[PDB]
Design a binder for this molecule. Sequence first.
Ligand SMILES: N[C@H](CCC(=O)O)C(=O)O
Lengths: 150, 151
Amino acid sequence: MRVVIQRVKGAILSVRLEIISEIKNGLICFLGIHKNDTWEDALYIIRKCLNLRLWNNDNKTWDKNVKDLNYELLIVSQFTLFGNTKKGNKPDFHLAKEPNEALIFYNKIIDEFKKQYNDDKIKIGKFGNYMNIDVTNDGPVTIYIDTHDI
Amino acid sequence: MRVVIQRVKGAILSVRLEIISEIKNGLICFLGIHKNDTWEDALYIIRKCLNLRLWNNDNKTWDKNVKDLNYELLIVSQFTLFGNTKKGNKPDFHLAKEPNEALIFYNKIIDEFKKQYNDDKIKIGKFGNYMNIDVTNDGPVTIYIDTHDIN
Ligand SMILES: N[C@H](CCC(=O)O)C(=O)O
């Protein structure tokens, strides 16, 4: 499983154009889901997202995590992360989980996100649909995790 | 070398704030240089950045690249990509290249980008400075490349 975590002042997610999602300060989380992810993969992700320490605090660095600062999370599904760029300039996304069944997985993950923090503080995007998101990158801080490194 | 590439309608790169960079359509690339990166490691990035066909063009999808549609690239150095998070919740940047050499390897990379696309098309941040980037994520579309899985 694959996540890009970008630290943000805020985020505003939009479909076709309308704002349906918003966080002010927090993390944006681009979530790619391999065809062979097991629930465990989804735990590791959920965990680190909440748990990683991407904020300095009062003369200390990399110290407080989302939860601590009472900050939100914008979870967007992103298969393009299994974009394969070793064939050629066109990317084949084979290695990503099939949308109809990936959608189940996402939702599970989104529920468990809430149970692992505070439902009031987890936002999402429309799975199927094309999205336009305005991001304020704070720093910025980009962090990559491929759960298949365990 | 690591890189995140997101397709975007535009971007604004401000510093501590007063602005320094805009792009309309195109790509933004957070690029992490690994302590050991050869010049090859660069090229693969640069090559794959310009040439990746990420825009639907006509009734075709995943077809046209950034140089084709005549779009910009904003290149933001981002060590936190070698934030080792595997063990611990405090990220571990030991695989990252020192900011003094990093600066020129980044420079050299920016040259080559220009040198290969166009001087006006390549935009940047202020290396290793707190930056703020308004990014209009179109799609969205995100691509990882670790140049170390390449043979
Ligand atoms: N690669 C993007 C995907 C956006 C979508 O999910 O529709 C596109 O073709 O527009």
